Amino acid sequence: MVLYFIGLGLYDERDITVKGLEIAKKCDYVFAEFYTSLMAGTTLGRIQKLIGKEIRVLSREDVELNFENIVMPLAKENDVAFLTPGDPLVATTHAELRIRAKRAGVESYVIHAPSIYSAVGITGLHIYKFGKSATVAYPEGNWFPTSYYDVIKENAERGLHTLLFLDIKAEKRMYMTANEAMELLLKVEDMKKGGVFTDDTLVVVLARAGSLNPTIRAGYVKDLIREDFGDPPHILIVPGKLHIVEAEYLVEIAGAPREILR
Amino acid sequence: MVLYFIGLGLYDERDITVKGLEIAKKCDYVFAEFYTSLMAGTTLGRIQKLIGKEIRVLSREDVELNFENIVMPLAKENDVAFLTPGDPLVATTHAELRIRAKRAGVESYVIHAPSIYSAVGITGLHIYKFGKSATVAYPEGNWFPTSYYDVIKENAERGLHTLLFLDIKAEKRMYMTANEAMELLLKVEDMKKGGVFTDDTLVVVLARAGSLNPTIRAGYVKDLIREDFGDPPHILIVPGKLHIVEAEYLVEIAGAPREILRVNV
Numbered sequence: 001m002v003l004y005f006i007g008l009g010l011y012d013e014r015d016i017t018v019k020g021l022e023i024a025k026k027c028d029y030v031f032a033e034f035y036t037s038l039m040a041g042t043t044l045g046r047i048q049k050l051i052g053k054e055i056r057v058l059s060r061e062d063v064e065l066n067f068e069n070i071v072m073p074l075a076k077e078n079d080v081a082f083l084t085p086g087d088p089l090v091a092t093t094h095a096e097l098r099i100r101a102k103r104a105g106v107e108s109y110v111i112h113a114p115s116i117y118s119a120v121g122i123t124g125l126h127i128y129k130f131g132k133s134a135t136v137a138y139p140e141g142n143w144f145p146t147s148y149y150d151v152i153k154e155n156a157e158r159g160l161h162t163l164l165f166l167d168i169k170a171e172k173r174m175y176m177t178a179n180e181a182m183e184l185l186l187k188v189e190d191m192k193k194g195g196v197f198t199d200d201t202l203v204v205v206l207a208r209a210g211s212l213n214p215t216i217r218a219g220y221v222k223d224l225i226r227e228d229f230g231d232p233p234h235i236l237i238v239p240g241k242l243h244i245v246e247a248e249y250l251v252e253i254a255g256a257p258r259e260i261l262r
Numbered sequence: 263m264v265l266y267f268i269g270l271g272l273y274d275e276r277d278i279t280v281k282g283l284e285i286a287k288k289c290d291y292v293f294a295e296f297y298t299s300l301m302a303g304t305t306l307g308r309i310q311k312l313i314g315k316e317i318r319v320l321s322r323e324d325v326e327l328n329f330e331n332i333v334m335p336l337a338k339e340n341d342v343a344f345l346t347p348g349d350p351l352v353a354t355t356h357a358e359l360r361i362r363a364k365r366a367g368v369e370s371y372v373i374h375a376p377s378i379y380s381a382v383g384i385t386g387l388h389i390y391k392f393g394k395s396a397t398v399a400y401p402e403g404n405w406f407p408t409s410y411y412d413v414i415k416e417n418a419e420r421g422l423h424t425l426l427f428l429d430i431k432a433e434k435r436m437y438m439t440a441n442e443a444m445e446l447l448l449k450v451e452d453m454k455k456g457g458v459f460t461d462d463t464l465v466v467v468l469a470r471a472g473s474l475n476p477t478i479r480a481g482y483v484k485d486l487i488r489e490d491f492g493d494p495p496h497i498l499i500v501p502g503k504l505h506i507v508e509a510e511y512l513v514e515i516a517g518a519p520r521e522i523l524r525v526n527v
């Protein structure tokens with residue numbers, strides 16, 4: 001009579017923690033969602049094979065509207081697991097489901113997994129220097145989101161790095177690329193004109209973190225806005241004031257222009 | 263010809279990823295450091311038994327001064343694993359080692375694992391609202407550092423949450439408690455008097471993140487400063503104005519006073 005929120009990690013089925021695996025292997029029913037992020041290095045089958053359980057994949061509507069109709073009932077009589085990409089409570093509204101579980105008399109436990117939020121440490125930027133985070137959202141119809149722009153502004157002023165989660169439309173197999181994010185930013189720039197994001201702004205791109213060879217690139221928007229960073233998912237970062245060791249790593253590992261060394 | 267940066271996880275020997283465990287098992291040499299942090303929910307022996315290989319422990323001096331002598335050599339002609347708590351490279355300094363590797367013609371790869379940086383999401387606080395992070399350090403001798411205080415002020419001023427790492431003597435295995443951290447911040451409030459941390463400030467304590475039964479508590483400093491949060495490690499969080507969804511979670515899951523639903527939203 002327990003509900004487990006278990007993370008699957010960054011890239012493939014092996015990014016799950018051993019704790020999460022051994023617990024998933026012994027659950028009676030296993031649910032999961034694959035709309036909050038993209039695990040580009042695996043498939044349901046490989047996940048199922050590793051866990052030895054048939055997994056019922058839920059949609060965003062299933063979760064946000066009928067979680068307590070689809071999952072909780074079984075959770076009151078069995079040991080249920082809910083799987084998600086990366087870490088279940090990072091950049092999702094899943095924490096709310098724990099409130100739903102409690103109100104339903106069901107106990108919930110959380111098993112963490114590698115998250116993009118801390119994986120960005122592989123870019124060499126100091127994790128403690130990241131300020132507020134934001135999401136670059138696809139424009140829909142006449143609605144054109146722009147708040148992420150101000151977030152970068154506020155952080156840069158304080159000399160802090162800005163982490164930008166990129167949009168996703170899982171039902172349409174759409175995963176926003178770093179390129180699309182920059183394009184959208186340049187457009188917000190020409191509208192608000194704040195000297196926040198331009199052709200000369202330094203950005204860091206991290207693609208498919210969790211794989212053995214992720215794409216880690218650093219340079220000026222003018223040089224990267226057209227570069228191919230590989231298949232999604234992608235994460236875009238607008239660094240603030242760089243420490244020497246940070247820029248060095250960016251040069252040695254992310255192939256950044258040495259003109260940032262001064 | 264390869265060097266593996268493998269993260270060990272949050273608490274115990276099972277917090278490493280399947281990927282990290284299988285790769286470590288296939289490595290010829292396995293190293294480990296426990297001076298950036300410890301793994302309070304387990305032991306070197308338990309980690310060794312799970313990996314099935316001997317683990318040679320490296321000290322700060324071993325790594326920061328002789329990594330090129332002790333590890334890199336073996337990596338040039340073998341598959342070598344370097345194990346560390348949390349997520350590799352989250353610790354400010356380790357990234358530098360990936361540079362040494364490249365120059366020594368040695369491939370290096372990073373195998374990720376959970377970090378408290380993302381694990382704090384279990385507190386119900388939106389990860390995007392976290393601002394600059396800081397470490398609360400013990401005053402010693404004539405030195406009395408107060409920069410973390412300033413970090414809280416700047417983040418809270420912008421409605422952002424502040425993640426505070428608590429001081430740790432890994433070598434001596436000594437943990438600063440959340441209780442002590444609260445006492446220190448109160449003294450800094452007395453010196454700074456900026457109205458950043460007082461008996462009325464709402465804080466969140468997260469202890470033993472990673473274990474199945476962590477301690478998550480939310481409350482006002484006046485009511486938690488003498489509460490027993492259990493065994494270390496302790497992480498202290500000073501949140502900014504709460505989203506109602508956050509306040510609801512802190513009340514229903516972290517036993518926070520209903521009062522936050524109106525006072526801190």
Ligand SMILES: Nc1ncnc2c1ncn2[C@@H]1O[C@H](CSCC[C@H](N)C(=O)O)[C@@H](O)[C@H]1O
Binds near residue numbers: 085088114
């Ligand atoms: N492995 C990865 N590599 C690069 N970016 C990733 C990634 N995983 C997630 N992202 C970024 O994060 C966005 C989804 S938000 C969900 C993040 C997930 N809960 C976690 O903890 O990691 C993706 O659209 C992308 O912008």
